[PDB]
Amino acid sequence: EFQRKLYKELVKNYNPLERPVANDSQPLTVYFSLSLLQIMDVDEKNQVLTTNIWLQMSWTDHYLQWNVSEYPGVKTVRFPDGQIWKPDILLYNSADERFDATFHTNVLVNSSGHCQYLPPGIFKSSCYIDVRWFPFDVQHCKLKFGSWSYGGWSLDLQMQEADISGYIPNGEWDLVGIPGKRSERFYECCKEPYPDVTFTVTMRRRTLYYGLNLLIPCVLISALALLVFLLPADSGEKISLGITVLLSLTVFMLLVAEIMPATSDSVPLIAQYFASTMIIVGLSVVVTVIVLQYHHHDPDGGKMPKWTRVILLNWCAWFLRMKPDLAKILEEVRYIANRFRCQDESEAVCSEWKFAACVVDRLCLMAFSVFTIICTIGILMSAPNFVEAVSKDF
Amino acid sequence: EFQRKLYKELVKNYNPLERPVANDSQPLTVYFSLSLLQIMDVDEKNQVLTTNIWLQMSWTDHYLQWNVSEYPGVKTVRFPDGQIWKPDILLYNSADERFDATFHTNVLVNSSGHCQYLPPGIFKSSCYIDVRWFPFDVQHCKLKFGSWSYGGWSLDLQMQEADISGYIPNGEWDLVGIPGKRSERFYECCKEPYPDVTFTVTMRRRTLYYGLNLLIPCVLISALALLVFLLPADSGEKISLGITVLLSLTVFMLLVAEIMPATSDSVPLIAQYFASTMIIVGLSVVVTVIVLQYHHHDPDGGKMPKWTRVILLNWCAWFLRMKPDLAKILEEVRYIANRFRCQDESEAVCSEWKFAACVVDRLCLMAFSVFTIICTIGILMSAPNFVEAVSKDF
Amino acid sequence: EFQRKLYKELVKNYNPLERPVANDSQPLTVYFSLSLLQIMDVDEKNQVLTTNIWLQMSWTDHYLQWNVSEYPGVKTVRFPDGQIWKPDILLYNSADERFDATFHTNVLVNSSGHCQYLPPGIFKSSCYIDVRWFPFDVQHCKLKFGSWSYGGWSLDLQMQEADISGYIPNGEWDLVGIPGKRSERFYECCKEPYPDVTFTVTMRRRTLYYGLNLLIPCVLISALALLVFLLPADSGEKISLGITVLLSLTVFMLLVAEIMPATSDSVPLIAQYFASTMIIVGLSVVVTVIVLQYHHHDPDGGKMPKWTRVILLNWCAWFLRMKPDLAKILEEVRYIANRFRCQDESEAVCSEWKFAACVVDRLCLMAFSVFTIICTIGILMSAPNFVEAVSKDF
Amino acid sequence: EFQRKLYKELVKNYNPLERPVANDSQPLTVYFSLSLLQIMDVDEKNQVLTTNIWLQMSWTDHYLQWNVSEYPGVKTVRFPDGQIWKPDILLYNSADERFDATFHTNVLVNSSGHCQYLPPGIFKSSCYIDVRWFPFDVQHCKLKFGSWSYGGWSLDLQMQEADISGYIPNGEWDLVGIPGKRSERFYECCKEPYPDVTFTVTMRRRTLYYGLNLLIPCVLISALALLVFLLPADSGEKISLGITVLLSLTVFMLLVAEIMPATSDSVPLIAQYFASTMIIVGLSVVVTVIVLQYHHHDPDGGKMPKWTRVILLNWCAWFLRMKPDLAKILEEVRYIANRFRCQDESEAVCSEWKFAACVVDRLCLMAFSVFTIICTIGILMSAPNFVEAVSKDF
Amino acid sequence: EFQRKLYKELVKNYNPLERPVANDSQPLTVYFSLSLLQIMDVDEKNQVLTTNIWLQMSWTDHYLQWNVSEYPGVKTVRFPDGQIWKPDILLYNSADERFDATFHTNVLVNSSGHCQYLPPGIFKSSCYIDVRWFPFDVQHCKLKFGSWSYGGWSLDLQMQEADISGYIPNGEWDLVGIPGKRSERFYECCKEPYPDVTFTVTMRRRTLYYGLNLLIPCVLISALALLVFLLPADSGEKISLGITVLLSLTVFMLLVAEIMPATSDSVPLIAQYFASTMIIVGLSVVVTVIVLQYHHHDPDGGKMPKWTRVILLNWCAWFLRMKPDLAKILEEVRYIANRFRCQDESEAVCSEWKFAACVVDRLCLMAFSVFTIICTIGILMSAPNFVEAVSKDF
Ligand SMILES: *[C@@H]1O[C@H](CO)[C@@H](O)[C@H](O)[C@H]1NC(C)=O
Ligand SMILES: [Ca+2]
Ligand SMILES: [Ca+2]
Ligand SMILES: [Ca+2]
Ligand SMILES: [Ca+2]
Ligand SMILES: [Ca+2]
């Protein structure tokens, strides 16, 4: 009886076009905040943050007021979209095809004319995802909000701290914080200044998934490549091992392209890490070819250089701690015996070449092993957030 | 005649904005339930449950009542969206881009003013999918429902048991149950408490598909890796077999990434199982390199250590149950014969090294076979639901 | 003049909320049928049938009637959505995110008050796709239609045979038929019975595409695996051939997962067929290892068992139809000659082992060839629709 | 002043439900045409043509007429959707989920009551894509348009030639033409005939992209397979080459499945071309096994058949243009010499077998080379549009 | 009080259908510009530019004017869609399924009747993406805008320079500029000329991502192929290396097809670059077969041609800087010695053939290395924007 009566009274002569101020010269104060419930998706390839947010808009409507002693029990009323004036606050950096992802809900108004509006929404925003340090990256995604059509002389937008009390954690992103800033800009369209409120979602990637599915594999594929330097040359499988490892690694790096954006702001950390890993496998194939050249050297070919004889078989090797009728019968047997002696000298020359191959193989094992460790450790720890990541996620 | 007459009468002065209570101070009781018809999709990568549900809302409208003796034959009326007051019950944890997936249908009202509203919908909800025990995982997906704008002082939301009598089973998920709980929370927005109703869909993954397409393959790819320990070394294909098996396995694990979310709450069970499988193939390649080192050992190189001579050729081997002119002619033939004897000693040394390779190869066959079984059995049965899964799905 | 006049008259006092019956106690008869124009997509992974349908609804509106002698030339009128009462017939088992895929069109009404409504639509329905016999599978997809809000006491839904006269055949699915059934169910929501009409689209997969792209390849990859049993062992490539074939086959089976649903109702026919094919390649690698063990047997190792000497070199082999100073010089040459004789005996032992490898290789060629044929023929013909498929598609 | 005045006058008593004819018995003539601006996508897997079209509808509204001497300067007026009667022309064979893709725009009306309506739209239509001759295929995609609810007695739909003057060429499809045909059909729903207008978009695939990315590769993968017949057998890599080529080819054919529909109307041309290519690689592996069998033949095994000795080493080979104490010492040396002679005879037998392998290898090189050329040329030129394609695209 | 009063006054008798001109004969001047905020996506496979734009429309409404001395403090008013006349400016070359991607916002009107309308939107436009020079390509994407229904006699559309002052740079595309052009065309539909405004977004691809992920790999896969010419032939792995490299490269080129459109306007630059790379690997396999033919030549086969003996072992080689009872015993030993001499001559012939293989191998190393460099450098630098790209991105 009193609710029906009040609704009929509150709409009499009410225009949702009118900004609901008592004094038309003064701006209307709109308090804008939001509640962050969930981060639904961070698309690094499309540069789009998807969040579940409850926008919070509160203002005062001069015309929607009543004495609660005359409509007893009616402390609040509710109005749908199109029936009450609302601030036209939009997400400026929207990525939604519809642009406005807000789900329009009721505006709750109490007797003193205070209006509360909390529309939910799945918001897609355009966020510059800096993948320079991926997977140890921290992201700062801005959500800029302001009135589209009402400038600062008509709508005085103020900011209230964002609420994260009902935030649901994400298994992939750690919410560092959601600081907000109110600013007033000028636009070429418009001499009047237009205030906006920007909430910067600060997000730390949780690195357990990427550590075990992307970074530890490369170590394993880098360790497999090093096993070529322990395969004997006579096995006949050092190129099979090395080139198969590089095939696997190339396929592995293709799968990684699915996640990164095709941008040129910087060369990511994963790309540098891949470059190091690529180098280990590519140069182990090059070195493997050299080792096979030494192993399969023709004993009747070019004699072993003096530099090769000393740098490998002496210095490196020590460092590595490797180390009538009867006359005619005589002629035939002597030819057979001299032939055998020639084979003995030739295979001794081959043995020297094979030993040099082993020394080169062992030298490069140590060199590639150490260089693998330094590049892995150096590239990873160059990330500012690596130490934080291992302490919090591992 | 009486239906036309009643519709004209029931809408006279009716305001869909008014909460349809006789006493404005009292809250309106809304009974909320739902019917679960089908689970359409569980997206573990996007963390979203898609269900086909018929929401069930029933309340009493004080103004939509008539005497059936005056409108004979008219026992019920129906009203579309916008013409009758409805509770603004939404899915709080919605993942739909539109947020509200409800398909608006009629409200059915009988003569005593009781209103029934059963809107269908394809609902997308944000469900935390715990993949710690995947593929033997049970999921608890919450569907939280409440009035967006009406707090507890205005809308007294009560819960009624969910209906699963028209539930259509899913080939992938077994519906354990759909328990529901009514709760009343406070929000930072609002001093007034807002009641909600949360239905927890409890779902057990049916594991036949994942057992045959994801878990039994790993056993087969783990068994293929073990066959390297039965290949002769002279075949020249033990690295080809081992490294090809690991290429296959890496490709296999790439395909598995398509299904899991990139989250860091925990390391899944499939990841641990893959880690065990990875270890078998990776260490069988490492052991294969060692076996080839033994097999291809240079007979003029470092003599066999005493530890190697006893630990392998004696202990392990027994355990494994393996086990003038005429003077010049004399000089030539004696050199030929002594040369042959030197080859005999050298190939005897090689035979010892080759036999040690066989013992190491057989030792690691047993060790990797047993360790493969324990890790497979141990990792799988560590899942709480493994025993239930095999009894119900296999 | 008469069309304008009639439209003004027909809408006077008309309420689209009112069920258009003369007697409010009696139900309104609605004849429901449909026209199937095309099957657009059968998504076996999402379990959703997409069809192009023209729903057919016809009823009688008591208020939309006129004498054609007073509005000459006006034999029919047309009304858009919202202006005329329509039955709220929905697809119960809808998979569309909007739930209602119907495109709202005009209702055509003639002078006697008969209303015809033929809204087109791209309908997505939830169909249980039984892949037990894929690719020789027949599907029965139900399309259940009924009034959402009007029960049997208010809307008497009758069924009329579906029309397929403008059906456009699908290159992948053969329309067996579209039988329909009217039924009346009770729901927990509602004491009143609610009639529905279910049209069961019966669809036979056309198997030419799947025969040539999925079943004949497996035969070719099963035939390639058999070629390992004709490769000589000295070629050194029997593991390369066998393990490469299994790599190809594994990749091939990954591509097949894209089409099947991750369900556990049954193990499909293609899975069983893959299991047979998997067995041929996996056991040919196991047998290849055994053949290489025999071929590369150490002539100074364990003597050939008596069971091996008879079961292979006799029975199987026959069945397979294979089959002073001068004294010192004497000592040296005799050692050389005796050494050569020892090599002759040892290589004779090796030749026996190599021959046993050939017999085992030929025995398994026949066994795997026959077993390959039986499993291929047996698994395929176990499908009830295999004979029909080959006669109609091949 | 005169525009405002005219709009108020033209809407007085106007009903958008009324067909705007002076005589209600006569049908209304609607001229239907369209403008083809672009072909946006041809989805051969979903069988859907996406086009950018400007529909062209023109008719005469009897009520929207004025004297331009009384509203000077007002030669035309414009009306939005819902305010003026429009023909309900739809795309019958629509594939859009909404069914109607038309973007509703103004209707332009001049003083004589002539109405022009040119709504743009991104139209998705169901087109039967005949892939029998892909990639040298010509497509005929129908776009059928007619009034949904107005039959021939009420709306006389006439056709006007389609406009392609603003057509933007597609890099993949060459617009042969867009002929149109007006027809009048009967439907089971309706005794009244319903006229339709069907525009057949005739499209020729431009084959440069598919020639270089799909057809020339197969030639290269067919040429690589032929190189197995020039590899020496002692290289030990003829199975590695052949089986790797077939692995590559299988992966290549998987990528091709992404483009073709899973239909059984016919076996496409690319499938036949793949079958030829598959045969070359598969039979080159089979022949490679036979060549290795000949090369690795046991010299103490079955003697060379007489058919083999003549068909290969003579006919084919010519055609191919290949071609006391001292007595005891005597016994030992004679055994050594006789042993060597036995090796010479045995390796001579092996040399004959190795030469037969070379002849078979060279015979199959020529046979597979010629057969490769004929199948490539024969399968490609069997397409009716192959000659046109090479002249226009190459 | 004055805002409420003004809104009631401004809408009195206002018709949003009327073009708001004082003189109905004169056209209405509409100033059209836009603001480019971000380029969201360039889809080269679908030929669609996605941009975030703020359209800028300004005109004068003759009826929406007031004296600010009578409504003090009210300097501007705002009107939503449907309440005020707006120009129906559309994107002609739209690719959006809805066609109109504009988000409708308020029109801001000041006291002198000047109207400002700045609707935001995510616009999808049909852009011809010329991939002739990809990845060093510059794109010119047109965005054509004009009134759909108002021709030049009714709406005089003028252009204002586009604003890029709030443009957010894209990590992949460098905004060269956004020039605009006003033009007036004639259409077959319409005798009246229709003005349009076309803004050409000029975009330069940033090439760092494509240089490191697509162009440098090909160099690495081209360098790996060259390593076959340094592998010894006795290693037995030159076909394994070469054919594995080509497998990797084929897989690499499959991944590249995901990005390019299936168009035939031209053969892209990446395709030509791939053709060069393909040639290096394919001809290195062909040359590898020839080298193996030389290496494995039968010493009892066709003698070395005179051309081969001079062109390789002399010219190329120098250029490359390579370089009673006792009588019977005599017969046996002489046969053994003569047999050994025959082996020495035969292996000397083999050594000559093996040396020729090395020379051919070294000759082709230099030839393929130089030819690889020229094709890489020549194909890349043939792009007009290559020099600009390396200076700006590298
Ligand atoms: C505007 O109003 C002021 C006072 O209200 C008056 O003096 C002036 O003449 C008016 N001018 C116009 C626009 O008629
Ligand atoms: Ca992410
Ligand atoms: Ca699932
Ligand atoms: Ca299908
Ligand atoms: Ca196409
Ligand atoms: Ca791009």
- The Cα–Cα gap between A7 and A16 comes to 15
Strand pairing report for E107-110 and E114-117: antiparallel
* Contact of D123 with D55, CB cutoff 8 Å: no
Number of domains in chain C: 2
Ligand 1 binding pocket includes E391 (Cβ within 6 Å): no
- Spatial CA neighbour of C230 closest among D213, D67, D293: D293
Q: Are E127 and E233 part of one and the same domain?
A: no
Per the CB < 8 A criterion, the answer to whether B115 and B54 are in contact is no
Rounded Cα distance between A130 and A58, Å, is 34
Which chain B residues touch A341 with a CB distance below 8 Å?
335
The two tokens of residue A93 are 């950096």
Q: How far apart are CA D167 and CA D173, in angstroms?
A: 12
Q: B169: cis peptide before it, omega within 30°?
A: no
Indicate whether D168 and D241 sit together in one domain: no
Q: How far apart are CA D30 and CA D28, in angstroms?
A: 6
User: What DSSP designation does D211 have?
Assistant: I
C76, C110 in Cβ contact below 8 A?
yes
**Integer angstrom CA distances of residue E272 from E134, E253, E285:** 11, 12, 20
Asked whether E29 and E93 are in contact (CB, 8 A), the reply is: no
User: Which contiguous run of DSSP H or E holds residue B158?
Assistant: strand B155-159
Q: Are A119 and A111 in contact (CB under 8 A)?
A: no
CB contact at 8 A, D199 and D127: no
Instruction: Tell me the C-alpha to C-alpha distance, in Å, between residue D30 and each of C28, D88, D115, D160, E18.
Output: 37, 11, 10, 10, 27
Chain E residues 164-203 within an 8 A CB cutoff of chain A? 165-166, 168, 170-172
Structure tokens at B241: 């077999």
Rounded to whole angstroms, the Cα distance separating B269 from B266 reads 9
CATH of the domain at A106: 2.70.170.10
Q: Are E363 and E315 in contact (CB under 8 A)?
A: no
What are the φ and ψ backbone dihedral angles of C103, each rounded to 5 degrees? -90, 115
DSSP-derived letter for residue B84 is S
Could you tell me which residues come within 8 angstroms of residue A91 by beta carbon, excluding any fewer than 6 positions away? Answer: A100, A101, A123, A125, A143, A144, A145
A46 three-class SS: coil
3-state DSSP helix/strand/coil % of chain A, to nearest 5: 40, 25, 35
Give the resolution value in Å. Answer: 2.3
Contact with chain D for residue C163, Cβ under 8 A: yes
Whether residue A267 contacts residue A351, with contact meaning beta carbons closer than 8 Å, is answered with: no
**Side-chain-facing half-sphere of C322: CA atoms under 13 Å:** 19
Same domain, A252 and A323: yes
Cβ–Cβ < 8 Å for E235, E370: no
The amino acid that residue B352 corresponds to is E
For residue D36 the two structure tokens come to: 């083809």
Query: Ligand 1 pocket, E344 CB below 6 A?
Result: no
Strands (E), chain D: 28-43, 48-60, 76-79, 89-91, 107-110, 114-117, 120-126, 138-147, 155-159, 173-177, 180-187, 190-205
With 0-12 CB in 10 A as exposed, 13-18 as middle and 19+ as buried, what is B96? buried
Burial class (CB in 10 A: 0-12, 13-18, 19+), E321: exposed
> Cα B80 from chain centroid?
41
- Amino acid in the structure at residue B379: I
How far away is chain C from the Cα of D293, in angstroms, using its nearest Cα? 6
* Domain end residue (candidates: E152, E176, E205): E205
Q: Is the CB of E72 under 6 A from ligand 1?
A: no
Probe target for ligand 1 pocket from E67, E68, E71, with the most ligand atoms within 8 Å of CB: E67
d(CA A220, CA A376): 12
What is the three-class DSSP state of E181? Answer: strand
Distance from the first to the final alpha carbon of chain D: 63
**Tokens 């004589």 correspond to what residue?**
D112
Give the Cα-Cα-Cα angle E107, E101, E258 (nearest 5 degrees).
155
- The C-alpha angle E256, E262, E265, rounded to 5 degrees, equals 115
Cα–Cα distance for residue pair B96/A121, rounded to 1 Å: 9
Same domain, B201 and B230: no
Judged by DSSP in three states, A15 sits in coil
| Type of residue found at C216 | I
DSSP β-bridge partners for residue D28? D155
Q: Provide the experimental method for this PDB entry.
A: cryo-EM
In this structure, the answer to whether residues A34 and A133 fall within a common structural domain is yes
Phi, psi of A314 (to 5 degrees): -115, -70
| Maximum distance among all Cα pairs of chain C, rounded to whole angstroms | 150
Which among D366, A318, B103, A160 has a CA at the least distance from the CA of C99? B103
A98/B99 Cα distance (integer angstroms): 14
Distance of CA E219 to the CA centre of its chain: 19
**Exposure of C320 by Cβ count < 10 A (0-12 exposed, 13-18 middle, 19+ buried)?**
middle
User: CB under 8 Å to D351, separation ≥6 — which residues?
Assistant: E300
CA–CA distance, E244 with E234 (Å, rounded to integer): 18
* Beta carbons within 10 angstroms of residue A307's beta carbon: 8
Residues D55 and D25 in one domain: yes
The Cβ of residue A177 has, within 10 Å, a number of other Cβ atoms equal to 11
* Euclidean distance between CA atoms A193 and A196, whole angstroms: 10
Number of CB atoms found within 10 A of residue D224's CB? 22
Q: How far apart are CA D85 and CA D155, in angstroms?
A: 13
Amino acid making up residue C308: T
* SS3 per residue for A306-359: HHHHHHHHHHHHHHCCCCCHHHHHHHHHHHHHHHHHHHHHHHHHHHHHHHHHHH
Element (H, E) at B51: strand B48-60
- How far is it, in rounded angstroms, from Cα C257 to Cα B255? 10
Are D276 and D370 contacting, i.e. CB atoms less than 8 angstroms apart?
no
Report whether E159 contacts E295 (CB < 8 A): no
- Asked if B52 and B127 sit in the same domain, the reply is yes
What residue of A is the nearest CA neighbor of E334?
A332
For residues E26-45, one letter each, b for 16 or more C-beta atoms within 10 angstroms of the residue's C-beta and e for the rest, the string is: ebbebbbbbbbbbbbbbebe
Alpha carbon distance B95, B122 (integer Å) = 11
Question: For ligand 1, is residue E18 a contact (CB within 6 Å)?
Answer: no
Residue the block writes with tokens 């016999």: C133
Phi/psi for B146 (5° steps) reads -170, 170
How far from E344 is each of C336, D171, E331, CA to CA, in Å?
A: 22, 66, 20
B311 CB-near residues (< 8 Å, 6+ apart): none
D342/B13 Cα distance (integer angstroms): 120
User: Which residues, 6 or more positions from A279, have their beta carbon under 8 angstroms from its beta carbon?
Assistant: A375
Q: Which amino acid is at A275?
A: A
3-state SS class at D341: helix
In three-state secondary structure terms, D278 is helix
Residues in chain C preceding a C-to-N separation beyond 2.5 angstroms (breaks): 323
Q: Which of E205, E236, E252 is the last residue of a domain?
A: E205
**Rounded to whole angstroms, how far apart are CA atoms D171 and D188?**
42
- Write the residue with the smallest CA distance to atom 12 of ligand 1: E67
Contact residues, D window 13-72, toward E, CB-based 8 Å cutoff: 35, 37-38, 40-41, 52, 54, 56, 71-72
Do D190 and D267 lie in a common domain? Answer: no
Residue with token string 């003579």: D314
Q: What span, in angstroms and rounded, lies between the C-alpha atoms of D220 and E384?
A: 31
Q: What is the DSSP string of D91-144?
A: ETTB--TTS--BPP-PEEEETT-EEEE--EEEEEEE-----TTTTS-EEEEEEE
C5's CB contacts (< 8 A; 6+ apart) are: C71
As given in the structure block, the two tokens for residue D155 are 């709306």
What's the CA gap between A15 and A83, in Å, rounded? 8
Same domain, A195 and A221: no
Question: Does D239 contact C at CB distance below 8 Å?
Answer: yes
The identity of residue C69, as a single letter, is S
Q: Which residues contact D307 (CB under 8 A, 6 or more apart)?
A: none
* A198 and A114 share one domain: yes
CB distance C224–D285 less than 8 Å? yes
Interchain contact C103–D (C-beta under 8 A) = yes
Is C332:C379 a contact under the CB 8 Å cutoff?
A: no
Per-residue HEC secondary structure of chain C comes to: CHHHHHHHHHHCCCCCCCCCCCCCCCCEEEEEEEEEEEEEEEECCCCEEEEEEEEEEEEECCCCCCCCCCCCCCCEEEECCCCCCCCCEEECCECCCCCCCECCCCEEEECCCEEEECCEEEEEEECCCCCCCCCCCEEEEEEEEEECCCCCCCEEEEECCCECCCCCCCCCEEEEECCEEEEEEEECCEEEEEEEEEEEEEEEECCHHHHHHHHHHHHHHHHHHHHHHCCCCCCCCHHHHHHHHHHHHHHHHHHHHCCCCCCCCCCCHHHHHHHHHHHHHHHHHHHHHHHHHHHCCCCCCCCCCHHHHHHHHHHHHHHCCCCCHHHHHHHHHHHHHHHHHHHHHHHHHHHHHHHHHHHHHHHHHHHHHHHHHHHHHHHHHCCCCHHHHHHHHC
Which of B2, B7, B171 is the closest to C261 by Cβ? B171
Write the residue in E126, E264, E296 that is nearest to D209 by C-beta: E264
Does C269 lie in the same domain as C193? no
**Which of the 8 DSSP states describes residue B362?**
H
Q: Given a contact as 3+ CB pairs under 8 Å, which chains touch C?
A: B, D
What's the rounded Cα separation, in Å, for the pair C139 and C135? 11
Under 8 Å between Cβ of C193 and C184: yes
Interface with A, mutate which of E5, E117, E238, E248 (most A CBs under 10 A)? E248
Q: Do E230 and A289 touch (CB under 8 A)?
A: yes
> E233 lies in which domain range?
208-393
| Cβ atoms of residues B7 and B77 within 8 Å | yes
Residues facing residue D91 across a β-bridge: D145
The HSE-up count of residue C367 (CA atoms within 13 Å, CB side) is: 13
d(CA E61, CA E314): 94
Residue spans of beta strands (DSSP E) within E308-356: none
Q: How far is CA A357 from the centre of its chain?
A: 43
Residue D378 and residue D240 share a domain:
yes
Cα gap A373→A387, rounded to integer Å: 17
* Contacting residues for C136 by C-beta, under 8 A, at least 6 apart: C205, C207, C269, C380, C383, C384, C385, C386, C389
- Of C53, C101, C199, C158, whose CA–CA distance to B120 is shortest? C101
Which residue, B155, B185, B205, sits at the end of a domain?
Answer: B205
Encoding tokens for residue C209? 């595409």
